[PDB]
Amino acid sequence: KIEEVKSTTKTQRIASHSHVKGLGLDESGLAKQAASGLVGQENAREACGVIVELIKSKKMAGRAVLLAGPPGTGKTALALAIAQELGSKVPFCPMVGSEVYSTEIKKTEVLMENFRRAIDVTLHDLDVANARTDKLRGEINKVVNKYIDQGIAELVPGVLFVDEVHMLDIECFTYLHRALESSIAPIVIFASNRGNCVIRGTEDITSPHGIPLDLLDRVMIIRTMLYTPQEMKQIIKIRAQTEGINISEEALNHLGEIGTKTTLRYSVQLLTPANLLAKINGKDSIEKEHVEEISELFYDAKSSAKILADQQDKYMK
Amino acid sequence: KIEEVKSTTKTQRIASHSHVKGLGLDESGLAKQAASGLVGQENAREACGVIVELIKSKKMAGRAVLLAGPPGTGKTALALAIAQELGSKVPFCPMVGSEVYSTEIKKTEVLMENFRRAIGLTLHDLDVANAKLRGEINKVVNKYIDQGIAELVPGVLFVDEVHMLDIECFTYLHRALESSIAPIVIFASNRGNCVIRGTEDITSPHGIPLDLLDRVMIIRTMLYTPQEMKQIIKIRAQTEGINISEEALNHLGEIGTKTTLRYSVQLLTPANLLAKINGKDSIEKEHVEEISELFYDAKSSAKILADQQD
Amino acid sequence: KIEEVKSTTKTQRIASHSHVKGLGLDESGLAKQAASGLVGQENAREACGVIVELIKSKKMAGRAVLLAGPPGTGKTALALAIAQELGSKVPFCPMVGSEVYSTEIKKTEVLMENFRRAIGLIIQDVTLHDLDVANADKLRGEINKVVNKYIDQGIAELVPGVLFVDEVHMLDIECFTYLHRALESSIAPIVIFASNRGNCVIRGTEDITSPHGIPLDLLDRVMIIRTMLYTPQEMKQIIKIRAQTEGINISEEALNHLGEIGTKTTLRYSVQLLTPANLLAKINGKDSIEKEHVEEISELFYDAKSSAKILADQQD
Amino acid sequence: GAHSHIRGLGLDDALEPRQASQGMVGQLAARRAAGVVLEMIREGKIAGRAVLIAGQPGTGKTAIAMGMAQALGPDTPFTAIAGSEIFSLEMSKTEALTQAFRRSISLHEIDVSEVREQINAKVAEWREEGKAEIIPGVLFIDEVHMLDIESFSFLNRALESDMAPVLIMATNRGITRIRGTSYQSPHGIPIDLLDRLLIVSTTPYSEKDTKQILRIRCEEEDVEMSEDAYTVLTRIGLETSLRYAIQLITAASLVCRKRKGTEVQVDDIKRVYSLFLDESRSTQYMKEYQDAFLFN
Amino acid sequence: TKVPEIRDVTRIERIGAHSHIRGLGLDDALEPRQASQGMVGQLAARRAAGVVLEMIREGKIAGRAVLIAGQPGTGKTAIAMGMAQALGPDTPFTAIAGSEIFSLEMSKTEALTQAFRRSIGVRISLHEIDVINSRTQGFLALFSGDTGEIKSEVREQINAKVAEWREEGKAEIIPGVLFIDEVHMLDIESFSFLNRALESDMAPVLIMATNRGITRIRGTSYQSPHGIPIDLLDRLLIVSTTPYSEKDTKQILRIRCEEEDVEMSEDAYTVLTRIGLETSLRYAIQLITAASLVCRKRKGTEVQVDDIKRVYSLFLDESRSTQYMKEYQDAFLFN
Amino acid sequence: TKVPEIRDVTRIERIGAHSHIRGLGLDDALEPRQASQGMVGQLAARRAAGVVLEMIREGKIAGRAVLIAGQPGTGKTAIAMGMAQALGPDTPFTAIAGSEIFSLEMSKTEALTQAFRRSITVSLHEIDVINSRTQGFLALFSGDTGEIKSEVREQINAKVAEWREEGKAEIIPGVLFIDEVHMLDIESFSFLNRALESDMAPVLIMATNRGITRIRGTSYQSPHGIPIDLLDRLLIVSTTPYSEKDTKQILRIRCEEEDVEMSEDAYTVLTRIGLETSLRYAIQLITAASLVCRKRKGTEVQVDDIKRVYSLFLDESRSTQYMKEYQDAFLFN
């Protein structure tokens, strides 16, 4: 009855991918070096150019995509640019794998309210006005089915991104697999950065990517590679000019050699507290004196445990 | 009120023992070679003769029989010969130890309806004709025994795979055994030292606690010789209308020594139907060389699966 | 509405500590050799003289006392000696850490009924659990409406006692949170722990080793006192005092043999062999005990350290 | 799904496979051994027993039992559920397997908690009338080594019924730990059920047998392929799997269509091979990466 | 209201073997004489119970308990049976093992209260009053196969009933004797129930038996002597029973023949004693009933060495049997 | 309806050793002057708390949190306590531990929402001691515990929703301090992600002294016991252990806050125990060392009243080293 429930979206999740406009492809099907926001990664960007064809030509019945690569090589950006290729604000609901371990709400409702967040109006957008629950969705599904049989509202399939997939237990993989065999279901792109792992809940079954073998043979795997130190700076250069942060050339190359020791999500995270430190000294941009100062105040997670473990032996005798 | 509830018996467990009619012992208490179905097992069939006389003389007050032997060596065929010798039409219910783990029936109920499958007048068939309700049948079975129109007879309970029962079921097997009405409980194990299920730090012989092991008499069953396994399969060919040749049993005893005895009896009915497709009558040596290649067992399949995959 | 419910406080725990009168200190705070029943253990008795001053000077806001030492050294006799130095029969409630694991009773209803034993009130001393047995959360709430009305008029007075908690490595991590929350509220009693271990796993986490089995957020509010083992020239004096409290005459050569047992075993095992060495002495027609009696009971009955050796050595 | 070309096991009356019949190509032994069971069902002797089909995945383990329904009477039900399909959140292990036996009899279409108790009371005397008869099912279970003995003891219960369908199980694992206990057993099955069922073993495909299936499935998804493309596609069929070599069929029917060729050449199969990986290379790559990161 | 006449509901099959002992076998000065009142040996462990019998008489067992530490097969139950006879003409006795509290019909607090209810004797035991006023039972295999429920309010009805009969002088109460066999099966949610039940005045005296050394305490992960918590081991009196000799083994088997009215030859006693030194004493007693049945089959009622060398091969013992499956499975671990 | 007058439920004794911390003590160009508002030393970590103080004000901290990883006894709280003072003269600051959320009077949701409402004048949880249920009586009603229903929590969340634009009601997001972050399992780590999506949630400071450890709740290992989906949104400040000159200055402020005049001989021996054993033990001795001087009537703690209380009360390093020796001799035969 109410159809202006305009925005109810987790903006802070996809705030870091504001510059991703498209996949950046040619009409023949080839990838360019730098186009529509993305830079490099020519193999996985061409592979997503086939997935957007099998989605449109009605050939993705039952299949899914697993983006398997190291952490910090843009698995979220290639799964966000795959949503702008469908065209005109197709939804996108990212979630981590450890989100379903909530105590106050059951596991079967967290993964269900994420499926109704991906299917302009989303299906979970209509489910927050009518609250002011399983018994409510019987009549809300009815009226949108009433609208399409009338012939007004068109139904679109979204993109549903599950990162950190090895923490999903066996009782939730079966709930996904019962939904992949529907007709209106979205594409259920996974992400994993691990090899052979133990399925959570069986304690003896070693499986590829933490995924059961029932779902694994309905899965197309795309590999994302690491970044060169040349193409690493072009990622930080786009993120510096999208946020309004001027940066010197001699200081950008020092921020691009930090990302060859840590992940790339540590270098882009240092754009804000180095720029606000450069507002204290009364400058507009950041220099090598500022980036070298932040790198001695803030530590990455892997090199912060190495500080404590190398003092753990000397503190306890 | 209703006393014609004639038959409700799981007759697939005792369908492969349609030839055992008794223990087959003489008057003085020795064992013959081949009588009443039983073949071989001399030091185990005379042991079950003393169990039979210990029940009728009422000197089995709080004891049980444990048959410890390798699988394929007659642990069920001896436990049916006790139920056949100890009176006619005495009930018998062979259960497996992995049957108390259901998902809709509590272990109190799935063990209680197994005791009352053994006590005949059975106590279980009275509780299915009108279907607590069971307490109503108590006054019904009260009036039958004291008027003299019906007798009360206990049977035989056979618990196969006793190493898979947990510590809660053993105490229920120990309390309900110590009445003057409870049937004899025959165990069956083929393991040595195991861990009692439910304690996971304490090892005991045969997977059985020391409360129910120092009041239980053990009877050992030995393996089978290749001139005795040519006598067991000769009876199963006779009691099923399956003609067979001499050079077939010569090969069917060789597959018996390799895997077990219970697998060789399985290979009769598919080998007969392979001989009825070609339009023959008797199982020649081509069929037993064929069915032993088309089908497998639980050992040669698992060994050929671990190697081919790896 | 009653205040004469005199009989409480079960005496089977404190039956073996009737000779304890107090710490027995001078006016300068130095220890005596033998005073008020207590004999020896001078260094851990002066430290309790410091702690008993901190309760009166109100500087013990949110702290506790550990007592680390080998068993058979008297960490329960010391904690009883500072629950009598406060003044005029203040209460005392000892326990064992594995008593919060009852079947029907909830884990907090062993700790809540233990805290109400160590809070005391023509005026005589009763406790908050003393009133609970008389009238019987709703039955425990209406008792608090009686006592808070009394302090508003000026008759009753609340005093804190001593809650001795032994075997602290058996309390799980869901019970130390209660012991951290209801320790520093307004008038909670002095909580004294006890342990005889080193690095023990906190029960309920299975990965986090910790000193004495205690969470690290609680151990930094704890003053640790060490009780030492005894020497046989004063270990005889401990068994000499326990004989006069029960009325048992004994010889000189008996205590020199019983003192040798108290060094091979605990001290409490040598106090175990005082009543069944006297009951056998009356059968032989001897009022006083000779050496042959305590040699005979030390050969009949065994301790838990020596009896575990016999069943293990004869099994293989 | 990908078993739509099978219309039977492809046997004559003398029970010898002719190696190319009714969609089935290859599987010389197991298609013959499933003809013996087809006689044992018709003679009414399979009661108390079941079939187990051991072998690798990718080896006809679904299509053999699928062909065993159409080699039976002309309209016979078939339920192919996986092993870990019952471990759901909307239903427990006594709800899912109850709907499996109610499906292959269909009675579950007549059902769609005590609705199962009224229809069996309804069809009690409706069966004695004779207007619509009953038929048995060919109920399948894939990957049975993920079940536990709270469900294995249900299978012994449900097989007692006279209207029960012939159970057909499947696995690909050797001596495993039983789910729910602490003993090793063959095929993840307790020993009360291993001593009463027929075990069939399937051997993996050859070079010639794999090419005939890839030729069939191209004609079912109407793609014109080149001859040199086939001899390089079956070479992926022997090294990696068959479910991945069947996956480059559609995904290389778009690369040729995008460049307007209308015939899948050898270059396109050697292009989609470098885009979409498989589980043998992807698991190898992160293992090769996380070891190098572990060193320094 | 009217239940003194439904006196006794007992288990005759648990305590049916140790009925040849009437007393403990001690003099007036607490020294055994090696053959008296059923007892045959263990002179050190039979006069240490004389000190325990004094402390129950004088009133000093309140707060302690008894532990009997010995092998399986050297008479741990027969020593505690002597304390039941020597404490009066009728003192109750209950031989409940450790692994009988793990029942699926009642919890671990309803199976330990009834062991503390059977061992409180009142004169005109306390548990027999409760079993009759609850419901009507004690019937054939249907009531044994089924069960009943015990309402918790009936227990305080009768505990307050005897609280008015005792001080009148008509009813006299007597503390019994409780036996807990195999104490290394009790967990810490039951060891903290025995500490909360010995606090009363009308509580019985606890006697425990174990055959384990340093065993992990059940319920936690710390190892202690006997599998007993430390708050309980510092109150126990531990007695140690030794294995029997050859002179004591024939003397016990000589007593157990008149109880099962068998006449045995003087050659068969020498071979029944050698089995009692090889497997156990409980196994050699078990062969006696199964040896005379073979002799009554052969007409002449006198067991020679022929029968004892016959039923030794028919019925195995529980130690020799477990080798034959291990030696079979050792050939099964090899290919 | 009428609860502004009952706003006084503040922890005074637990956070009462950090009484001399009146801010970070920084200049206008972020440079510590080695002595400012009581804070002494820690030059590297105090500058990094100034940069975090910037990103809170402009509003760059939305979707981010702070983690302080260092050795125990190195001022992990005094840096996180001064950040409450430098951000404003009245900011709420609750310093609950990690093991204080595993209780039996509530769940892990009612014990973590109780921290997220205690750090948002009065705190927002302070309304729920009067507008929820009537308590505040004597000691056993602190031992007993009642619950605050969720329906009470939507009465107050809808009450102040229209008072925000009224002007008289102003909101101040404080700072929550979750000490010992590795004790929390991921049944509650997915509750910090739910509450940091709000528009009024405070800044979340945590602390740990553990290296690569195991995530409690699962079987995987991650740095600092924090899941890797939340480690990629943290600012990690590290502390450096004190020296022999910083430790002499810390106890001189604490003796001033406890009015005990000690000699300069006693100050160099109290940092000798502080360099060797611990820092939270050296300040623990100061009360129990003065009480012995008062009984000998000097009102000036000498060096003998330090070496007496050093022998009476032990520390955590010696109380387990001695029981290790006794359990070794007990093991020997």
Ligand SMILES: Nc1ncnc2c1ncn2[C@@H]1O[C@H](COP(=O)(O)OP(=O)(O)O)[C@@H](O)[C@H]1O
């Ligand atoms: N090809 C790319 N084009 C533009 N930005 C990229 C690209 N790859 C990575 N990034 C940047 O790096 C970050 C990668 O995010 P995410 O996918 O979560 O890392 P990971 O790949 O480790 O999962 C994003 O913030 C994104 O802006």
Ligand SMILES: Nc1ncnc2c1ncn2[C@@H]1O[C@H](COP(=O)(O)OP(=O)(O)O)[C@@H](O)[C@H]1O
């Ligand atoms: N200083 C002392 N004076 C007199 N008796 C003592 C003294 N110290 C210990 N005891 C006695 O020694 C026994 C040991 O008590 P305790 O140290 O609590 O041992 P545990 O901690 O092992 O239970 C107590 O019964 C007590 O009576």
Ligand SMILES: Nc1ncnc2c1ncn2[C@@H]1O[C@H](COP(=O)(O)OP(=O)(O)O)[C@@H](O)[C@H]1O
């Ligand atoms: N003998 C065969 N003849 C024809 N097609 C086969 C044969 N074996 C397997 N296939 C095909 O291979 C694919 C594998 O299906 P499935 O039987 O599920 O694989 P698996 O062998 O792993 O069980 C199916 O599409 C099936 O059509």
Ligand SMILES: Nc1ncnc2c1ncn2[C@@H]1O[C@H](COP(=O)(O)OP(=O)(O)O)[C@@H](O)[C@H]1O
């Ligand atoms: N000193 C003894 N006097 C009489 N009988 C004994 C003696 N020692 C052992 N027995 C006999 O040994 C058997 C063992 O009984 P019990 O004590 O229950 O077993 P265990 O010795 O294994 O604890 C009993 O039947 C008992 O008659």
Ligand SMILES: Nc1ncnc2c1ncn2[C@@H]1O[C@H](COP(=O)(O)OP(=O)(O)O)[C@@H](O)[C@H]1O
């Ligand atoms: N740099 C510092 N400035 C001021 N006080 C400090 C400093 N470092 C430590 N302290 C003092 O030391 C004590 C340590 O407190 P806390 O930080 O909780 O210990 P930890 O370092 O183990 O977390 C506090 O009382 C604090 O006042």
